[PDB]
Amino acid sequence: SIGLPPPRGLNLLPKSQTTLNLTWQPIFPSSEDFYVEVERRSVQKSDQQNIKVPGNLTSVLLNNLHPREQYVVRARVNTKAQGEWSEDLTAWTLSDILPPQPENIKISNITHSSAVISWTILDGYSISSITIRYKVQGKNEDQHVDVKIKNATITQYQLKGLEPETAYQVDIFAENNIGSSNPAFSHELVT
Amino acid sequence: DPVLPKPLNAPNVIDTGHNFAVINISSEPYFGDGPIKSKKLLYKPVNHYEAWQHIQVTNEIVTLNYLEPRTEYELCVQLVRRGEGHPGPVRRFTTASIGLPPPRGLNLLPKSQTTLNLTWQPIFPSSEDDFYVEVERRSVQKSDQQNIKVPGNLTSVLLNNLHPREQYVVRARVNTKAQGEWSEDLTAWTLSDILPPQPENIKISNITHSSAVISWTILDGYSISSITIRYKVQGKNEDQHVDVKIKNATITQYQLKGLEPETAYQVDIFAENNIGSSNPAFSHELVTLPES
Ligand SMILES: *[C@@H]1O[C@H](CO)[C@@H](O[C@@H]2O[C@H](CO)[C@@H](O[C@@H]3O[C@H](CO)[C@@H](O)[C@H](O[C@H]4O[C@H](CO)[C@@H](O)[C@H](O)[C@@H]4O)[C@@H]3O)[C@H](O)[C@H]2NC(C)=O)[C@H](O)[C@H]1NC(C)=O
Ligand SMILES: *[C@@H]1O[C@H](CO)[C@@H](O[C@@H]2O[C@H](CO)[C@@H](O[C@@H]3O[C@H](CO)[C@@H](O)[C@H](O)[C@@H]3O)[C@H](O)[C@H]2NC(C)=O)[C@H](O)[C@H]1NC(C)=O
Ligand SMILES: *[C@@H]1O[C@H](CO)[C@@H](O[C@@H]2O[C@H](CO)[C@@H](O)[C@H](O)[C@H]2NC(C)=O)[C@H](O)[C@H]1NC(C)=O
Ligand SMILES: *[C@@H]1O[C@H](CO)[C@@H](O)[C@H](O)[C@H]1NC(C)=O
Ligand SMILES: *[C@@H]1O[C@H](CO)[C@@H](O)[C@H](O)[C@H]1NC(C)=O
Ligand SMILES: *[C@@H]1O[C@H](CO)[C@@H](O)[C@H](O)[C@H]1NC(C)=O
Ligand SMILES: *[C@@H]1O[C@H](CO)[C@@H](O)[C@H](O)[C@H]1NC(C)=O
């Protein structure tokens, strides 16, 4: 019996600090029984468990892991003979601590109306979103405008509708499954 | 021929003030015979040389008025032969000093669902005699008044056993032997036991390619500290939103700025109190104009 190809449409997502959700698209059977072999492998530590789980299921939980730890998974479709391995899917587990403050803060493109701001984040804290709290510098302090960005891929955002010749105090937070960064660094921006 | 009457005991002073005095005259028991049609109450300042002042006493408890402050008076009763006499024993009393003003810098802040904290300036005593602070709190929603006496020296009270989201009008004064003037009415709301109501009268207007004003209304007394206007593009991406947290609840309008032209937006609005945020029944929709 020739070996089957690896599972089609694989994806790995953090369920929790101690678990990962391995999702994949099911396939039509050819038994003449069959199961799916899944191995996960820690990057930071030297730990490799091998799960042999039923073939007809859609997805599997990878329980008993450590927090804030990177893992690499790959799986086969085993029948009478052993199949071929999939590509290496990588995903961190959810963080057990607060994330760091974003470095390399570059404010630019200053005009009367609009402005742009740039930042960079450290990988491996499960950063779900970042917030750019900006407000007027003076002692009035009657309001602020947070702008929460739910896509971590983004590293720039253009602010719009600022009043000309006005001093704005811009802070930048970063968020995750636990909490948020606590930076003491304020950043001025005059229009 | 007969035996004329006079009381056994001196008058008793029930209550006094700088201006007035209230006195049980004690016409009974008394020596002598018969009935009494009318009776006097003689009074004057102890050592001073003028005429004794007489008032006719019908009931028993009498109210002396037009007195002088800080002066020692003496009191005695006469009874007349009826139908139409020696004066009875003497009681001395001193009228009260002048009534102090109320405490300054009165500030009533709420601190819980069931408590309010009143604070005033430390007041230095002008007079020598003793003094204390009387504090009245009065519910507006329900009929509920409570009086709290507070020592003269310390400078604040915790008004407690109050109800959640109920306003109380408060006054205070400084009492001595005499009773001082009432302060101005401080008013405040106790904290909310529930989430705040959703803001009413949400009206979007002045829509533009890069602007749109939103206006709302909020019910008073739910301890609403702030409101938040959340907006995002209606597309299924949900890549980002923008919160506009307004620090004071007095503001009822906000102009959104820097919006994308020809773009559908989803506006939500939240009131915020001591507990949390108001739950919307429904979100709001707007579409920005295109340029020309
Ligand atoms: C009713 O309201 C009044 C007014 O709010 C309230 O008075 C408060 O009482 C507290 C406690 O007696 C006092 O607080 C002081 O505040 C100073 C700074 O102004 C602090 O430094 C003092 O010490 C604190 O902070 C230190 C920090 O280094 C700590 O090391 C220390 O352990 C203390 O925590 C001090 O406490 C002050 O008189 C006011 N405070 C305020 C903020 O108004 C009154 O107590 C309320 N309640 C009642 C029942 O009257
Ligand atoms: C982690 O893995 C679990 C199971 O190990 C995943 O369970 C799947 O969850 C989805 C909902 O996201 C469900 O799918 C359902 O499929 C039927 C048709 O088969 C459809 O009618 C439903 O509307 C729904 O889409 C279902 O509970 C389950 N999938 C299947 C095929 O049984 C779970 O999604 C994974 N969790 C995460 C966070 O990725
Ligand atoms: C004014 O004072 C008189 C004398 O103290 C009061 O009469 C006494 O009242 C109490 C009971 O309330 C008892 O000591 C005696 O029963 C009373 N004694 C006499 C002699 O009557 C009286 O209460 C006061 N009068 C009024 C009208 O209030
Ligand atoms: C997958 O496997 C079992 C094998 O006994 C099968 O009976 C069952 O229908 C499947 N499980 C489901 C649909 O949850
Ligand atoms: C400034 O912003 C505009 C878009 O409004 C963009 O095309 C341009 O590249 C920006 N310039 C810099 C230096 O980032
Ligand atoms: C107020 O006077 C009382 C008298 O018993 C004393 O015990 C208390 O310490 C005084 N409070 C002050 C000075 O704050
Ligand atoms: C809407 O608000 C007032 C008129 O009611 C005006 O000052 C403002 O310019 C209007 N907004 C826009 C975007 O035109």
PDB file of N, CA, C and O in Angstrom, chain B residues 5 7 30 79 123 133-134 148 152 159 169 191 199 217 225 227 243 245 247 271 292:
ATOM      1  N   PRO B   5     -51.993  83.295  98.377  1.00  0.00           N
ATOM      2  CA  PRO B   5     -51.106  82.210  97.950  1.00  0.00           C
ATOM      3  C   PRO B   5     -49.769  82.640  97.324  1.00  0.00           C
ATOM      4  O   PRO B   5     -49.648  83.749  96.796  1.00  0.00           O
ATOM      5  N   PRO B   7     -46.204  80.250  95.312  1.00  0.00           N
ATOM      6  CA  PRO B   7     -45.649  78.909  95.040  1.00  0.00           C
ATOM      7  C   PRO B   7     -44.612  78.399  96.050  1.00  0.00           C
ATOM      8  O   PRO B   7     -44.044  79.186  96.812  1.00  0.00           O
ATOM      9  N   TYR B  30     -48.419  75.143  95.872  1.00  0.00           N
ATOM     10  CA  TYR B  30     -48.394  76.501  96.415  1.00  0.00           C
ATOM     11  C   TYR B  30     -49.046  76.587  97.796  1.00  0.00           C
ATOM     12  O   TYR B  30     -49.983  75.845  98.093  1.00  0.00           O
ATOM     13  N   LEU B  79     -49.117  85.042  92.325  1.00  0.00           N
ATOM     14  CA  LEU B  79     -50.471  84.505  92.177  1.00  0.00           C
ATOM     15  C   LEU B  79     -51.444  85.460  92.868  1.00  0.00           C
ATOM     16  O   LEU B  79     -51.156  85.945  93.967  1.00  0.00           O
ATOM     17  N   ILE B 123     -12.745  75.276  61.655  1.00  0.00           N
ATOM     18  CA  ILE B 123     -13.113  76.617  62.082  1.00  0.00           C
ATOM     19  C   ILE B 123     -12.545  76.877  63.479  1.00  0.00           C
ATOM     20  O   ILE B 123     -12.656  76.048  64.383  1.00  0.00           O
ATOM     21  N   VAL B 133     -21.242  70.654  65.822  1.00  0.00           N
ATOM     22  CA  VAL B 133     -21.789  70.778  64.460  1.00  0.00           C
ATOM     23  C   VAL B 133     -23.001  69.859  64.260  1.00  0.00           C
ATOM     24  O   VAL B 133     -22.890  68.638  64.398  1.00  0.00           O
ATOM     25  N   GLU B 134     -24.147  70.459  63.933  1.00  0.00           N
ATOM     26  CA  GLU B 134     -25.372  69.730  63.596  1.00  0.00           C
ATOM     27  C   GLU B 134     -25.466  69.613  62.079  1.00  0.00           C
ATOM     28  O   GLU B 134     -25.338  70.619  61.384  1.00  0.00           O
ATOM     29  N   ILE B 148     -27.513  64.413  62.409  1.00  0.00           N
ATOM     30  CA  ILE B 148     -26.286  63.874  63.001  1.00  0.00           C
ATOM     31  C   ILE B 148     -25.516  64.984  63.718  1.00  0.00           C
ATOM     32  O   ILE B 148     -25.201  66.014  63.119  1.00  0.00           O
ATOM     33  N   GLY B 152     -17.244  69.548  67.932  1.00  0.00           N
ATOM     34  CA  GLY B 152     -16.824  70.857  67.429  1.00  0.00           C
ATOM     35  C   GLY B 152     -15.479  70.882  66.719  1.00  0.00           C
ATOM     36  O   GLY B 152     -15.322  71.578  65.711  1.00  0.00           O
ATOM     37  N   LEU B 159     -22.024  60.560  56.308  1.00  0.00           N
ATOM     38  CA  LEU B 159     -23.467  60.322  56.331  1.00  0.00           C
ATOM     39  C   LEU B 159     -23.689  58.959  55.707  1.00  0.00           C
ATOM     40  O   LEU B 159     -23.241  58.724  54.590  1.00  0.00           O
ATOM     41  N   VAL B 169     -30.262  66.271  49.994  1.00  0.00           N
ATOM     42  CA  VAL B 169     -29.949  67.672  50.252  1.00  0.00           C
ATOM     43  C   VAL B 169     -29.450  67.757  51.689  1.00  0.00           C
ATOM     44  O   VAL B 169     -30.068  67.199  52.595  1.00  0.00           O
ATOM     45  N   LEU B 191     -23.875  56.630  44.961  1.00  0.00           N
ATOM     46  CA  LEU B 191     -23.457  55.845  43.795  1.00  0.00           C
ATOM     47  C   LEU B 191     -24.543  54.877  43.313  1.00  0.00           C
ATOM     48  O   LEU B 191     -25.481  54.548  44.049  1.00  0.00           O
ATOM     49  N   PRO B 199     -27.914  55.879  26.607  1.00  0.00           N
ATOM     50  CA  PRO B 199     -28.255  57.281  26.338  1.00  0.00           C
ATOM     51  C   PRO B 199     -29.401  57.452  25.328  1.00  0.00           C
ATOM     52  O   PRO B 199     -29.386  56.835  24.261  1.00  0.00           O
ATOM     53  N   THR B 217     -28.612  62.072  24.969  1.00  0.00           N
ATOM     54  CA  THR B 217     -29.187  62.499  26.250  1.00  0.00           C
ATOM     55  C   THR B 217     -28.959  61.393  27.284  1.00  0.00           C
ATOM     56  O   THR B 217     -28.988  60.215  26.937  1.00  0.00           O
ATOM     57  N   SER B 225     -20.233  58.996  35.024  1.00  0.00           N
ATOM     58  CA  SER B 225     -18.963  59.714  35.061  1.00  0.00           C
ATOM     59  C   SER B 225     -18.421  60.029  33.669  1.00  0.00           C
ATOM     60  O   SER B 225     -17.694  61.001  33.514  1.00  0.00           O
ATOM     61  N   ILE B 227     -18.996  59.165  29.004  1.00  0.00           N
ATOM     62  CA  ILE B 227     -19.607  58.475  27.861  1.00  0.00           C
ATOM     63  C   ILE B 227     -18.558  58.152  26.798  1.00  0.00           C
ATOM     64  O   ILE B 227     -17.554  58.859  26.668  1.00  0.00           O
ATOM     65  N   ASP B 243     -12.592  54.437  19.819  1.00  0.00           N
ATOM     66  CA  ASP B 243     -13.330  54.862  21.012  1.00  0.00           C
ATOM     67  C   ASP B 243     -13.061  56.337  21.287  1.00  0.00           C
ATOM     68  O   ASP B 243     -11.926  56.798  21.160  1.00  0.00           O
ATOM     69  N   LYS B 245     -13.746  58.446  24.455  1.00  0.00           N
ATOM     70  CA  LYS B 245     -14.151  58.553  25.857  1.00  0.00           C
ATOM     71  C   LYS B 245     -14.170  60.022  26.283  1.00  0.00           C
ATOM     72  O   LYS B 245     -13.121  60.673  26.328  1.00  0.00           O
ATOM     73  N   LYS B 247     -14.697  62.667  29.189  1.00  0.00           N
ATOM     74  CA  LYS B 247     -14.450  62.581  30.637  1.00  0.00           C
ATOM     75  C   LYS B 247     -15.581  63.127  31.503  1.00  0.00           C
ATOM     76  O   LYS B 247     -15.807  62.610  32.593  1.00  0.00           O
ATOM     77  N   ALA B 271     -22.826  54.993  28.014  1.00  0.00           N
ATOM     78  CA  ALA B 271     -22.656  55.776  29.241  1.00  0.00           C
ATOM     79  C   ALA B 271     -21.922  54.909  30.256  1.00  0.00           C
ATOM     80  O   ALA B 271     -22.084  53.691  30.255  1.00  0.00           O
ATOM     81  N   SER B 292     -16.574  66.250  -4.218  1.00  0.00           N
ATOM     82  CA  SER B 292     -16.793  66.799  -5.563  1.00  0.00           C
ATOM     83  C   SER B 292     -15.756  67.871  -5.888  1.00  0.00           C
ATOM     84  O   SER B 292     -15.280  67.966  -7.018  1.00  0.00           O
TER      85      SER B 292
END
